[PDB]
Design a protein around this nucleic acid. Structure first.
Ligand SMILES: [Zn+2]
Length: 78
DNA sequence: CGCCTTGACCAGCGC
DNA sequence: GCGCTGGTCAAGGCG
């Protein structure tokens, strides 16, 4: 259902942008008590017809990876 | 227009 | 009840 994706990214790209075939609207960004890097919160470009939610944050275990986390599935292709 | 920012809002969950 | 934590709002700008 809610999948997870680890993406190698240079540590200078601090945008937390993960290209994944969809476009997204950013609705927040917060630091969490276990990772001193920010977590970005997105929703699908097809919201609210689409329920997919998105989180991107740099892995605390491997700083060379971003972690992208999704919730739900789309109803489109674009 | 629409997206990003950022601090404020929230609620729920463990005591 | 209550402090904490992540998740979300919604206002102020800006390409
Ligand atoms: Zn979608």
């Amino acid at each position: 259902n809610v999948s997870t994706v680890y993406v190698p990214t240079e540590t200078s790209d601090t945008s937390l942008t993960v290209k994944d075939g969809f476009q997204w609207r950013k609705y927040g960004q917060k630091v969490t008590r276990d990772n001193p890097s920010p977590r970005a919160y997105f929703r699908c470009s097809f919201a609210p017809s689409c329920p997919v939610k998105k989180k991107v944050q740099r892995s605390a275990e491997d700083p060379s990876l971003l972690v992208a986390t999704y919730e739900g599935t789309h109803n489109h292709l674009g």
